[PDB]
CSV table of C-alpha atoms and ligand atoms in Angstrom, one decimal:
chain,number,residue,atom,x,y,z
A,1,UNK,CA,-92.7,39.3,-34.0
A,2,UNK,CA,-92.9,38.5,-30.5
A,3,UNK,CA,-96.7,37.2,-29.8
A,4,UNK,CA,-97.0,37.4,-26.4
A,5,UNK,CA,-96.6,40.1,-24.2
A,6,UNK,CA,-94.5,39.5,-20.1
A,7,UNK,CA,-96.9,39.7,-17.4
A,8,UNK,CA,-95.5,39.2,-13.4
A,9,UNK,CA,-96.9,36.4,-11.9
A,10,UNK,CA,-100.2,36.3,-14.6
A,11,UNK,CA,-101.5,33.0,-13.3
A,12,UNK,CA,-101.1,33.9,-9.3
A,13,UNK,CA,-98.7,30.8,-9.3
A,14,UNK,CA,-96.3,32.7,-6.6
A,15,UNK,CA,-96.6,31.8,-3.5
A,16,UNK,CA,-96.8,27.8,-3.8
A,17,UNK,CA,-100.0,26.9,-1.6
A,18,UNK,CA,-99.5,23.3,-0.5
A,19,UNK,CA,-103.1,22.8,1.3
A,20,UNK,CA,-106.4,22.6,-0.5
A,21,UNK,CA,-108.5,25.9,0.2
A,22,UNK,CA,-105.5,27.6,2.1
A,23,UNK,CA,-105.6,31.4,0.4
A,24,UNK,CA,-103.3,34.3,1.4
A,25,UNK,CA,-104.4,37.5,2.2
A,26,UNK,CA,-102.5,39.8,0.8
A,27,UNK,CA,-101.6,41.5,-2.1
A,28,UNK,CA,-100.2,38.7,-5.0
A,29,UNK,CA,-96.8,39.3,-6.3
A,30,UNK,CA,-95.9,41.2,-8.8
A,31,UNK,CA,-100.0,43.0,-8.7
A,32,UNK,CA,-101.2,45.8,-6.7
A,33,UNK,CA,-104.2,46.5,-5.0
A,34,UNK,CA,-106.7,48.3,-7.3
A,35,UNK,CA,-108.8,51.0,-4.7
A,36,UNK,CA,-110.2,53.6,-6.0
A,37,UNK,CA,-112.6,53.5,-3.5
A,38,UNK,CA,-110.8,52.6,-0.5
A,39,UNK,CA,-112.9,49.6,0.0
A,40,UNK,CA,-109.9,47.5,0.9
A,41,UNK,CA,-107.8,48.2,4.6
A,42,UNK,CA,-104.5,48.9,5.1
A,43,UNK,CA,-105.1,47.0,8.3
A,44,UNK,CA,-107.1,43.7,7.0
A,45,UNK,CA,-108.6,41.2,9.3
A,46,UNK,CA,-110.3,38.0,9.0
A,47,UNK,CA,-113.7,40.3,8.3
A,48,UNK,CA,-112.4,42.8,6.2
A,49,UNK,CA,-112.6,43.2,2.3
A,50,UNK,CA,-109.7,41.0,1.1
A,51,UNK,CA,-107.3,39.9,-1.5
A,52,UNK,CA,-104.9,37.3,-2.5
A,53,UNK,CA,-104.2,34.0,-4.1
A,54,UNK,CA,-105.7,30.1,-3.3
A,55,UNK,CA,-104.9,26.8,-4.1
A,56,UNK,CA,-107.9,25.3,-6.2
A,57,UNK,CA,-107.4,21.4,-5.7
A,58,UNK,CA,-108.9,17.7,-5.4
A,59,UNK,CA,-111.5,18.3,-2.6
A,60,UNK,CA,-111.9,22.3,-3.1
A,61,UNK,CA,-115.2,22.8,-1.3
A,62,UNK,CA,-115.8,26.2,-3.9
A,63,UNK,CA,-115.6,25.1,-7.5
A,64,UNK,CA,-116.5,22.5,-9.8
A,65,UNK,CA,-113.3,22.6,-11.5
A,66,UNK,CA,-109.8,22.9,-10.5
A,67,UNK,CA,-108.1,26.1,-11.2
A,68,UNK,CA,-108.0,26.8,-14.8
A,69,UNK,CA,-104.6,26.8,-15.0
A,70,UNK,CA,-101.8,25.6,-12.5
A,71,UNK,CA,-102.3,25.3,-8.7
A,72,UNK,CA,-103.8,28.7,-8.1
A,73,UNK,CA,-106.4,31.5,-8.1
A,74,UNK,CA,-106.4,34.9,-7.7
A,75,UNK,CA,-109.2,36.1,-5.1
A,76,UNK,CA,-111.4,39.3,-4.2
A,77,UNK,CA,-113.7,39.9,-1.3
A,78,UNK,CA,-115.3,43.1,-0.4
A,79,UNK,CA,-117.0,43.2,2.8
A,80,UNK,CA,-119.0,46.3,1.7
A,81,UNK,CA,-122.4,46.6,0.6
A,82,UNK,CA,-123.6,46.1,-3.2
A,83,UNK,CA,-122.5,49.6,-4.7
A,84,UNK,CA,-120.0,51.0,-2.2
A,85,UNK,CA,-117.3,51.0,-5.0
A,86,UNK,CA,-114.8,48.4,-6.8
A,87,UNK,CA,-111.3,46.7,-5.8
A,88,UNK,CA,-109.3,44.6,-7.6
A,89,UNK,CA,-106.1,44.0,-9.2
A,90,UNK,CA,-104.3,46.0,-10.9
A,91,UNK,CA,-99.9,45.7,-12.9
A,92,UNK,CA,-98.8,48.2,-15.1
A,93,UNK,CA,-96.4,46.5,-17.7
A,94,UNK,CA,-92.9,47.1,-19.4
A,95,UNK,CA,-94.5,46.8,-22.6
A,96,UNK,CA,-95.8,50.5,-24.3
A,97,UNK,CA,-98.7,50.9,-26.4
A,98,UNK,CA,-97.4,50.3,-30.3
A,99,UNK,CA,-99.6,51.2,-33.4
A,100,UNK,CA,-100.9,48.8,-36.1
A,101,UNK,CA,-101.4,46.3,-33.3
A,102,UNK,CA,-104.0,44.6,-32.3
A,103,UNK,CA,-104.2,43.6,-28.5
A,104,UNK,CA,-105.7,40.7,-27.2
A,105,UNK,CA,-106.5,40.3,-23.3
A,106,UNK,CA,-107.7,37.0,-22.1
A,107,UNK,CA,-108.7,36.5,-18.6
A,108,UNK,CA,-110.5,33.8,-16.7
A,109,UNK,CA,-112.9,35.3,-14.2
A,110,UNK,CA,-114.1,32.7,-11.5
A,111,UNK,CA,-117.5,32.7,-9.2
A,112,UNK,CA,-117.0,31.5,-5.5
A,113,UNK,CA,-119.2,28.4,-4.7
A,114,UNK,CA,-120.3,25.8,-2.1
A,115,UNK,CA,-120.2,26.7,1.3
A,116,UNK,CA,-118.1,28.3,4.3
A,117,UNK,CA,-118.8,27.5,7.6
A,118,UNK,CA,-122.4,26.6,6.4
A,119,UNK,CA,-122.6,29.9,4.6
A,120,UNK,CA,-123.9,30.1,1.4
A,121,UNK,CA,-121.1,31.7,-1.3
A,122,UNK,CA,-124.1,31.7,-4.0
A,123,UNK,CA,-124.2,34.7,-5.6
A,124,UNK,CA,-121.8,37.1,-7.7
A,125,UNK,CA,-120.5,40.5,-7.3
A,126,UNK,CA,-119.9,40.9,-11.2
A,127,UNK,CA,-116.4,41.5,-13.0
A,128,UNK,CA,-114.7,44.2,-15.1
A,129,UNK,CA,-111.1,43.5,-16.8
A,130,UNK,CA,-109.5,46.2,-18.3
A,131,UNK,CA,-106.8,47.1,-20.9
A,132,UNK,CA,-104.6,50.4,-20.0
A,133,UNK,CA,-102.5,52.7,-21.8
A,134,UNK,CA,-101.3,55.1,-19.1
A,135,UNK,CA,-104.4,56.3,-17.3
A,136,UNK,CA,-106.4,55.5,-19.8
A,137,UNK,CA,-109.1,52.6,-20.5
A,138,UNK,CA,-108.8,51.8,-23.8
A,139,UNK,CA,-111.0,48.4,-23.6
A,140,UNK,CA,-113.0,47.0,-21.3
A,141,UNK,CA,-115.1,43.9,-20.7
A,142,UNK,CA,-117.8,45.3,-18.2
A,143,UNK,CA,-119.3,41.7,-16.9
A,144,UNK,CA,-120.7,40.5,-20.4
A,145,UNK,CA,-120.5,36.9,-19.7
A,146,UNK,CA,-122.8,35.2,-16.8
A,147,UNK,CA,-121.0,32.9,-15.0
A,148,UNK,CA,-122.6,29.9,-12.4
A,149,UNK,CA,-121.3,29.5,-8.6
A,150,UNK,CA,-118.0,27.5,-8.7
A,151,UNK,CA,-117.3,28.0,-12.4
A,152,UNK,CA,-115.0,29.7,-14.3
A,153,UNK,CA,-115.1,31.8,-17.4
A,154,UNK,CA,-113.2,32.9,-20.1
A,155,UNK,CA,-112.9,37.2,-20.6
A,156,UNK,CA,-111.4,38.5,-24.0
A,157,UNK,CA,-110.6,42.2,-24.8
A,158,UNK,CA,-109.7,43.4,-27.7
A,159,UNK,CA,-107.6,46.9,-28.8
A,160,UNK,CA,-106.3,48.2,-31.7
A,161,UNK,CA,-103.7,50.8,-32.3
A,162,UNK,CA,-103.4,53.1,-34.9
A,163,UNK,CA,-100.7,55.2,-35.8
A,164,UNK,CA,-103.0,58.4,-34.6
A,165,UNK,CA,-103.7,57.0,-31.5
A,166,UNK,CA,-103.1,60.1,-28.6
A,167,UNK,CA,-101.8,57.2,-26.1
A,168,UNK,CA,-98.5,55.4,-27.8
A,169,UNK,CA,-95.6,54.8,-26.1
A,170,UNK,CA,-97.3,55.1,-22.9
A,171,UNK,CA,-97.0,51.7,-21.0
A,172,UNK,CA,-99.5,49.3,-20.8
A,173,UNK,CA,-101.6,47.9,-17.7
A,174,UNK,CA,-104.4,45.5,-17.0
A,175,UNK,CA,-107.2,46.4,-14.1
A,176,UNK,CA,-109.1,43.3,-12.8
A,177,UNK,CA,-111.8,44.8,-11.0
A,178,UNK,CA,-115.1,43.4,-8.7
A,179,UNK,CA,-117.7,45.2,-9.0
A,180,UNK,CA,-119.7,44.5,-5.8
A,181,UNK,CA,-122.8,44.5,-7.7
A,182,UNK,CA,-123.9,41.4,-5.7
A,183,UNK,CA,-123.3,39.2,-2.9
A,184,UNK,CA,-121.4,36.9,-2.0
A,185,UNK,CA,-119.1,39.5,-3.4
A,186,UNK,CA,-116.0,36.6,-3.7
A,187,UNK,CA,-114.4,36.6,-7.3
A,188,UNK,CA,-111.5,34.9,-8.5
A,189,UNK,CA,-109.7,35.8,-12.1
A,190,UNK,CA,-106.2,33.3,-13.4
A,191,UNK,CA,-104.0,32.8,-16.2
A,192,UNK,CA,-104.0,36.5,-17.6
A,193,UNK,CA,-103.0,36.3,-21.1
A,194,UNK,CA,-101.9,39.9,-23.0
A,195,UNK,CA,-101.1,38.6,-26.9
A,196,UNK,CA,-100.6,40.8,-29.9
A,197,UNK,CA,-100.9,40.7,-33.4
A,198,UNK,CA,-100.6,43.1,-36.7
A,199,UNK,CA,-103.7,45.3,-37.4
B,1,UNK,CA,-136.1,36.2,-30.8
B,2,UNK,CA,-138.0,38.8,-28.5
B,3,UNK,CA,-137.6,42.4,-28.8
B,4,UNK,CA,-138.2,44.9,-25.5
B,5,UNK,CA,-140.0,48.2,-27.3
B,6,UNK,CA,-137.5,51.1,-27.8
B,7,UNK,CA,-138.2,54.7,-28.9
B,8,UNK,CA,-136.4,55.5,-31.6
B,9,UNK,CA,-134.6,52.8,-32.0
B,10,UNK,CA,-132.9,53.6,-35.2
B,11,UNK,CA,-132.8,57.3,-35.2
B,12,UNK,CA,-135.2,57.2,-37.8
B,13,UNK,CA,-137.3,60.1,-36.5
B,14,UNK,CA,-137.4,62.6,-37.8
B,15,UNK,CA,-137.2,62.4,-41.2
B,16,UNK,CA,-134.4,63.5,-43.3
B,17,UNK,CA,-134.6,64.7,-47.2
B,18,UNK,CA,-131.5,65.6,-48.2
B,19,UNK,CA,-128.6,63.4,-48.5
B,20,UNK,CA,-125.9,64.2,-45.5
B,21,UNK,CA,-127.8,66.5,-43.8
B,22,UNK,CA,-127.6,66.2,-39.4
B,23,UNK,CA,-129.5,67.8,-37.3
B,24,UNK,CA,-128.1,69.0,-34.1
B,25,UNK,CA,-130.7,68.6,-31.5
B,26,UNK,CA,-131.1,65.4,-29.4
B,27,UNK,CA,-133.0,62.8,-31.2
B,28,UNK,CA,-136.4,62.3,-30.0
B,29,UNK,CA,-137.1,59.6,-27.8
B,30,UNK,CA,-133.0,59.7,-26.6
B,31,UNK,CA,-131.5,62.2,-24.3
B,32,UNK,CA,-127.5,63.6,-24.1
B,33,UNK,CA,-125.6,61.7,-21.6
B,34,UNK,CA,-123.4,65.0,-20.2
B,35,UNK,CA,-121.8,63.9,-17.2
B,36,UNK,CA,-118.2,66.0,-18.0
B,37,UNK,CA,-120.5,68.8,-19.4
B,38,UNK,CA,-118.9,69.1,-22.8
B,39,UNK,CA,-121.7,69.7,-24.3
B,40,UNK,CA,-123.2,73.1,-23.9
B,41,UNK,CA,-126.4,74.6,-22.8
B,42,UNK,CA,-126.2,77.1,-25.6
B,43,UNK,CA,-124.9,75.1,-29.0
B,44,UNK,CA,-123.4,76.4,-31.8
B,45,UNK,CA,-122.8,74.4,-35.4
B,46,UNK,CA,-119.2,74.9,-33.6
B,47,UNK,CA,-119.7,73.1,-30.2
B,48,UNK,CA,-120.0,69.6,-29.3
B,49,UNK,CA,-123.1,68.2,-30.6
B,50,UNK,CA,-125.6,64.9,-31.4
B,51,UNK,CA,-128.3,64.5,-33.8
B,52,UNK,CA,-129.0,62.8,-36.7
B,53,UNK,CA,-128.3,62.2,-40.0
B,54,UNK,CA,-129.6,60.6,-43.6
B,55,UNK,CA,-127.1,58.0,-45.3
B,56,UNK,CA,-128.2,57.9,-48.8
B,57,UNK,CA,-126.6,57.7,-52.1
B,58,UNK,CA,-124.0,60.2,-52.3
B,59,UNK,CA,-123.0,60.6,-49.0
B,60,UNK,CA,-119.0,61.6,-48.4
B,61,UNK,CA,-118.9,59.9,-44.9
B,62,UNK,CA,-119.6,56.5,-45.2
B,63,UNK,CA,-118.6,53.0,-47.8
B,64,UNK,CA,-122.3,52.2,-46.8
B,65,UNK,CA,-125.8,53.3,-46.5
B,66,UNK,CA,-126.9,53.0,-43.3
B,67,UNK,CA,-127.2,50.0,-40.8
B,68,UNK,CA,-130.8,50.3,-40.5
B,69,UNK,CA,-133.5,52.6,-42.3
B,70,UNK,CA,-132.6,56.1,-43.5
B,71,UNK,CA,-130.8,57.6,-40.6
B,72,UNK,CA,-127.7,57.3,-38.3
B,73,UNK,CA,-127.2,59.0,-34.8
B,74,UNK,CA,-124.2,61.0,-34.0
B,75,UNK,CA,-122.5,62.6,-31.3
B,76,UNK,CA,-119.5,64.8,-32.0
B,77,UNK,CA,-117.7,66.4,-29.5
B,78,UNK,CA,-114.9,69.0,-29.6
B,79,UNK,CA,-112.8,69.0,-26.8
B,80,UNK,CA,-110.0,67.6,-26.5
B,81,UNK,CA,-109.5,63.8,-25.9
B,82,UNK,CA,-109.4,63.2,-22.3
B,83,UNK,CA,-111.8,65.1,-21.5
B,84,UNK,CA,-113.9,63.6,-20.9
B,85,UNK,CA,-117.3,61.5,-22.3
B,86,UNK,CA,-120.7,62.3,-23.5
B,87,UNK,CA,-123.3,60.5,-25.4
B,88,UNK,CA,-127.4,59.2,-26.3
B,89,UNK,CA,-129.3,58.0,-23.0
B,90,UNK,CA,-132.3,56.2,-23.2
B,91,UNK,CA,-134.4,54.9,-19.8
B,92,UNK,CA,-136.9,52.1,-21.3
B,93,UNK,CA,-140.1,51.2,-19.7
B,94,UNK,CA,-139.2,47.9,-18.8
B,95,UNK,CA,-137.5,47.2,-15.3
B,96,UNK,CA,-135.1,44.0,-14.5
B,97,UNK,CA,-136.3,40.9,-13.8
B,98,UNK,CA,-134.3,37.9,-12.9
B,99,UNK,CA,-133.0,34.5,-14.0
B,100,UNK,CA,-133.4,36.6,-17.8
B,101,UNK,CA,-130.5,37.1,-20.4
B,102,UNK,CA,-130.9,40.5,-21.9
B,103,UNK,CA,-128.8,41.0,-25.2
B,104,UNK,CA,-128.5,44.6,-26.7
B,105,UNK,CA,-127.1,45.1,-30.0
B,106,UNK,CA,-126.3,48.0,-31.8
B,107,UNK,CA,-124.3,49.5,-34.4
B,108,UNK,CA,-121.3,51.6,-34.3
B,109,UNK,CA,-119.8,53.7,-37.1
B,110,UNK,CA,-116.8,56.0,-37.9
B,111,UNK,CA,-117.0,59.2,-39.9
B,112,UNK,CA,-115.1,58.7,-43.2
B,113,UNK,CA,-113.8,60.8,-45.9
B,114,UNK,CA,-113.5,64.7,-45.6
B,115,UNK,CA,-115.8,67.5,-45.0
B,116,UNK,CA,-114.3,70.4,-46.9
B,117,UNK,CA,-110.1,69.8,-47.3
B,118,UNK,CA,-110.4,68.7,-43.5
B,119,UNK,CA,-110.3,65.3,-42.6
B,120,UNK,CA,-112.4,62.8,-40.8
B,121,UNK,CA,-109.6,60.0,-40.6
B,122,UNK,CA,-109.4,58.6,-36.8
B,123,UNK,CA,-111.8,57.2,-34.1
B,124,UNK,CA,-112.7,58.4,-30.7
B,125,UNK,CA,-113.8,55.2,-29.1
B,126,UNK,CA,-117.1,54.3,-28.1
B,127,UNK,CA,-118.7,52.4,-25.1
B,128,UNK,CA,-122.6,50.5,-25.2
B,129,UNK,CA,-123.8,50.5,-21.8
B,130,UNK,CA,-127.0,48.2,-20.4
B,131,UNK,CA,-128.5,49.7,-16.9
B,132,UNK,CA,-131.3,48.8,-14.4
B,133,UNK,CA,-131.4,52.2,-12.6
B,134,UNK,CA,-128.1,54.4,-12.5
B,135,UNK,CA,-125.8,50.9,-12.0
B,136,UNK,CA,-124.2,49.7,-14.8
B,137,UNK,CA,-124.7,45.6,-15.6
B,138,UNK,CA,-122.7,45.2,-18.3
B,139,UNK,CA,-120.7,47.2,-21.1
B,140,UNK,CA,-118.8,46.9,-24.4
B,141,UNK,CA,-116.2,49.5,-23.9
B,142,UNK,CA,-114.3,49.8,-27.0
B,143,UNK,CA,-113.9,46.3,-27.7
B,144,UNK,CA,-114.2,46.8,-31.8
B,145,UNK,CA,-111.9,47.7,-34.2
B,146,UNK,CA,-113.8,50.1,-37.0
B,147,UNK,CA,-111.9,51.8,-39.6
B,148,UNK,CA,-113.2,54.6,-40.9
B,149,UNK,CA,-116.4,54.8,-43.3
B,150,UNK,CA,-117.3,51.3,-41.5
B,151,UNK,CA,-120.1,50.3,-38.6
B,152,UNK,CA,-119.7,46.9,-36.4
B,153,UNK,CA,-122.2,45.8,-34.1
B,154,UNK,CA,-121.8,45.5,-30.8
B,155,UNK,CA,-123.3,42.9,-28.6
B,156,UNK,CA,-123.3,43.4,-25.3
B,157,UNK,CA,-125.0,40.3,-22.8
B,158,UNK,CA,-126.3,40.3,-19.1
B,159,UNK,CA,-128.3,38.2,-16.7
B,160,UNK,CA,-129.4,38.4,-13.4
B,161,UNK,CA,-130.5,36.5,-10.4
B,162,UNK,CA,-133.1,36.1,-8.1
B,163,UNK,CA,-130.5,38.2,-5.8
B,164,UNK,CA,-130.3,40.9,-8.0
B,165,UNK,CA,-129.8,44.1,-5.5
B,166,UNK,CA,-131.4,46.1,-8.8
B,167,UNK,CA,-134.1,44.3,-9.5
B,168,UNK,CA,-137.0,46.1,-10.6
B,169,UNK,CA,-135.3,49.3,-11.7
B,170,UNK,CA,-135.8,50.3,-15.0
B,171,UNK,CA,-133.9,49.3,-18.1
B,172,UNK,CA,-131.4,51.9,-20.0
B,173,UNK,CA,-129.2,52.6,-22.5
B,174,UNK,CA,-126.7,54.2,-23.1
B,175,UNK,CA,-124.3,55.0,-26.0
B,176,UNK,CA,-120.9,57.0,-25.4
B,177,UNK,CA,-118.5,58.8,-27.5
B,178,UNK,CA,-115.1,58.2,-25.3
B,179,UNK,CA,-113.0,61.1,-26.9
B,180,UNK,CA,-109.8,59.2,-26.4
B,181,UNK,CA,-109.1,60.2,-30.1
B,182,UNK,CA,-109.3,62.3,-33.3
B,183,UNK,CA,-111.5,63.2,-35.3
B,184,UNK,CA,-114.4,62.5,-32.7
B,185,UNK,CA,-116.8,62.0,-34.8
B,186,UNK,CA,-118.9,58.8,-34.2
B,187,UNK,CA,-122.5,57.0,-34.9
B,188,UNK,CA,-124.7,54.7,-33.8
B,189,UNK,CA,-127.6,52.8,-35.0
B,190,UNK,CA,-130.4,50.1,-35.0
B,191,UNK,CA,-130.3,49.8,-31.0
B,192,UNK,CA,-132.0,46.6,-30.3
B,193,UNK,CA,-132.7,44.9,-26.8
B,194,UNK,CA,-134.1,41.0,-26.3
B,195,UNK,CA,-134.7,39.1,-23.9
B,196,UNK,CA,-135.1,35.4,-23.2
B,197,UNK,CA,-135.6,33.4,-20.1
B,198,UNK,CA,-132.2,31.9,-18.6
C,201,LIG,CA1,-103.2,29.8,-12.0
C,202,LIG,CA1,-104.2,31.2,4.5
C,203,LIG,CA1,-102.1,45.7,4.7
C,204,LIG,CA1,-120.7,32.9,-5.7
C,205,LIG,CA1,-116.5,27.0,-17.7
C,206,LIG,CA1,-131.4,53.9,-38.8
C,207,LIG,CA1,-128.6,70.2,-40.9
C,208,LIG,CA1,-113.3,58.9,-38.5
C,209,LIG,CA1,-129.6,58.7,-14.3
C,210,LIG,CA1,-119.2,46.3,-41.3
């Protein structure tokens, strides 16, 4: 009866970011890198596609809003053109697939906004968050919801098991993926929530 | 509400007499999304296959007649899951514009019941897809819960700005049996698309 399902680091609270605007760039704790198409480095630089986590606080020159839950944001850049692939984030759990269970994934999916060094971060790559068993998809949000420069969002997948389902006992994993079906290709996601409930 | 023409929206060509009767040949106006190849040139009443069929009063599939009209459309595949996806395409006439929220809605069904002392029991998954061109803008992938017997409509949302990079490609459709389960059997109908400035 246990409603909520562990997730490492779900709200990209680790590291503690003291300064405003100061983002890492690397890989958040307790995530992987999600590149399937190779769009992120090994060797980053300040130019290249990028990923990591950011302090959203008072003063934030990219959001309306401060993050929507905690200190801070999970972020992804690509530095590619509009189709050259998707990046993101990606954890496989502890948790297995069980049957006559429904699965509820809640995301927040942010849109860059304001300006950097008088550049424009208007625009939006587009989003896809994903539920796992294994390998295996087995719900998706594919960017349904529109969302403005410097707001936030709220994502929610659904699954639900059933006892014939090919994929139990395989464990389960969450995929939050940019798209980079638009520029400025910056997207932030927090405060992944994986709850469950009988079918 | 304002509707962006379809052909075929509800499978309701062609015309169906008898009562649980499918074709197995593409549905006009629709073509087979194939991009793992399970379904073969050649067909057999044995292979993977789409169509159509009538709902009507008693039918052995379903705990309802169907969504829209007389007919449903079906794609059954016979592989086994994993192996890939297949599916109805549709490219419409119309092409994206921006700063417009397109909606597409359409229904989703799961064979029910038995067909000769074998069983229909289980779902394969589904997934609704909006394009503009060969880029997908945004897609339901198996967000709904349908037991079998049973449709649920899926709603799937997108809009675009002026920055668009696929702006003035044209609009498609398509709807996808996932084969990530047993039996694969699974239907679609009443496709409709609207649109409304943003
Ligand atoms: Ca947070
Ligand atoms: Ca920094
Ligand atoms: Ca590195
Ligand atoms: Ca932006
Ligand atoms: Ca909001
Ligand atoms: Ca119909
Ligand atoms: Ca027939
Ligand atoms: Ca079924
Ligand atoms: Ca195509
Ligand atoms: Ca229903």
């Amino acid at each position: 009866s246990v409603v909520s399902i562990p997730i490492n680091n779900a709200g990209f609270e680790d590291p503690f970011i003291e300064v405003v605007d100061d983002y890492t760039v690397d890989t958040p704790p307790g995530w992987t890198t999600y590149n399937p198409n190779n769009l992120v480095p090994e060797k980053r630089t300040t130019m290249t596609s990028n990923n990591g986590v950011g302090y959203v606080g008072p003063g934030t020159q990219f959001y309306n809003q401060l993050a929507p839950e905690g200190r801070n944001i999970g972020y992804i850049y690509l530095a590619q053109k509009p189709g050259s692939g998707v990046a993101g984030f990606e954890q496989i759990l502890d948790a297995t697939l069980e049957p006559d269970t429904k699965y509820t994934l809640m995301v927040d999916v942010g849109n860059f906004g304001g300006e950097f060094q008088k550049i424009s971060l208007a625009g939006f790559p587009g989003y896809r968050v994903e539920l796992l068993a294994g390998d295996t998809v087995l719900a998706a949000d594919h960017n349904n919801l529109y969302i403005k420069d410097g707001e936030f969002k709220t994502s929610t997948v659904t699954f639900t098991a059933t006892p014939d389902n090919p994929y139990l006992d395989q464990k389960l994993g969450i995929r939050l993926i940019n798209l980079l079906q638009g520029t400025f290709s910056g997207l932030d996601f927090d405060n992944v929530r994986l709850t469950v409930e009988p079918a």
